[PDB]
């Protein structure tokens, strides 16, 4: 028996996701100490990110951009930070280098979108923008999503540092030097990274809604909170506890 | 690396710390005498 109808059900979430507050943000924390905004109980438009054309990179892992409105996620961790332009491919999950092992290692297997644009016109500065920094020394490379904001002195040999810089005694981080005059590889770029989450499917972060009414006691294709299949939906004697 | 006598140990795409366990079939060496204040002219990408 083929499905008679297609059903969609979502909650009463009509408020929009605050993606402007991470995409349109005067402050992006630099690569050494990146931002993270947890998105919840809201409706997005991820197609706006491809309907608009200002981006240099819009690369997706474990998802593809077009069908996305067709999913709902538990949460999104929208990570946000600023970089030089050339090293933008370091982020892509597991690729290693100086940025990935000491600043922003993405997980081996990743279910997210990496999205980036040239920011030279707003956050290059004639002083070289020494507000924006990246780490390039650490006693070990970090685990996924791990944040470390510590700035204590590192050593590249036996030479004791005692909390101050010198020969063999290193401050762990430096600026990219974002002068407005730079090659595009050394110019600043804004980046955000949307990590999606598809767990027990209690979806609070959404694509555009457009939900439909119920059908009972006949075969239909269905979607509840992004969980989906084909079946004969019926009233039931299932005494769920109120959280299930 | 730990020699008191050495006065300059510039490393080009290398480190003395990682050198001891590093295996190399072919990277040759040269010996010569210099006026100390122009020793920088050994380095790549500069003129003199």
């Amino acid at each position, epitope marked *: 028996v083929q499905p008679t109808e297609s059903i969609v059900r979502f909650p009463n979430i009509t408020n929009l996701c605050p993606f402007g507050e991470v995409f349109n943000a005067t402050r992006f924390a630099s690569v050494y100490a990146w931002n993270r905004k947890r998105i919840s109980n809201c409706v997005a438009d991820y197609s706006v990110l491809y309907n608009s054309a200002s981006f240099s990179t819009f690369k997706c892992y474990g998802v593809s951009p077009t069908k996305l409105n067709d999913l709902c996620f538990t949460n999104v961790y929208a990570d946000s930070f600023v970089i030089r332009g050339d090293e933008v491919r370091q982020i892509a999950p597991g690729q290693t280098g100086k940025i990935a092992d000491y600043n922003y290692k993405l997980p081996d297997d990743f279910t997210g979108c990496v999205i980036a644009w040239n920011s030279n016109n707003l956050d290059s500065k004639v002083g070289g923008n020494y507000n924006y920094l990246y780490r390039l020394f650490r006693k070990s490379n970090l685990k996924p999503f791990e944040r470390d904001i510590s700035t204590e002195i590192y050593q590249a040999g036996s030479t004791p540092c005692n909390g101050v810089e*010198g020969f063999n005694c290193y401050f762990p981080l430096q*600026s990219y030097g974002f002068q407005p005059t730079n090659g595009v590889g050394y110019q600043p770029y804004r980046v955000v990274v949307l990590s999606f989450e598809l767990l027990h499917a209690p979806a609070t972060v959404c694509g555009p809604k457009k939900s439909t009414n119920l059908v009972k006691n006949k075969c239909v294709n269905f979607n509840f909170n992004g969980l989906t299949g084909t079946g004969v939906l019926t009233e039931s004697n299932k005494k769920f506890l109120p959280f299930q | 690396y730990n020699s008191a006598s050495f006065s*300059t140990f510039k490393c080009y795409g290398v480190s003395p710390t990682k050198l001891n366990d590093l295996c190399f079939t072919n990277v040759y060496a040269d010996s010569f005498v210099i006026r100390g204040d122009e020793v920088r002219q050994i380095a790549p990408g500069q003129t003199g």
Partner: antibody
Amino acid sequence: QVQLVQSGAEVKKPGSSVKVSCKASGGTFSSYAISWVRQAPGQGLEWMGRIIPMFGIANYAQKFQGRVTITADKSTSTAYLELSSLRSEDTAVYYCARYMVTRDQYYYDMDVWGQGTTVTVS
Amino acid sequence: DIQMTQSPSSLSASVGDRVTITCRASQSISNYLNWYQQKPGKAPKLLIYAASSLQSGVPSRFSGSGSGTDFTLTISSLQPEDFATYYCQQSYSPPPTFGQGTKLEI
């Protein structure tokens, strides 16, 4: 780019404790280290300590440790010094200077200096 | 760790002449050293930020003839501004110690 500007001179008593301050002009404290130095009149320069306004972490030489303390706010691009047990030999001109601890693996290049504060007894 | 000294105590010279000054210290410094000048009570200014490297926007009136430790700075065509007191300073280890300074007379 930036020029450091600094507190006016002070006349004091032996056994006193004292306050001086320095701040950016023509720019701001974009994660530079800033440091304090004594010029005793006609002697060599003596380094007091390091602070980074971006992180608040600071250090002193043993000659000044406990005798001096320093602080800074990035919120108003300003750094502060206080000194105690005055006038064992502490009649001097006190200067801030910046250096770029987050620019290369090289340090203490005091490329810009403050206006100088005299602290003295009379 | 490191003590420093600086020599000679003073010199006398003419505008446009060549004049040389020396740093000395307890240890090998691996070229981690700076050089500065002032008129008395004025804000100091840096000339050189390694054993030899001249700072950008400083004119070619100076060179650092040194390597490893116990360095020298030369004045090159002495300016009337080079009546200033000169200081060396090690950056090799904390505290970043200065030399005792030296005076040039016109």
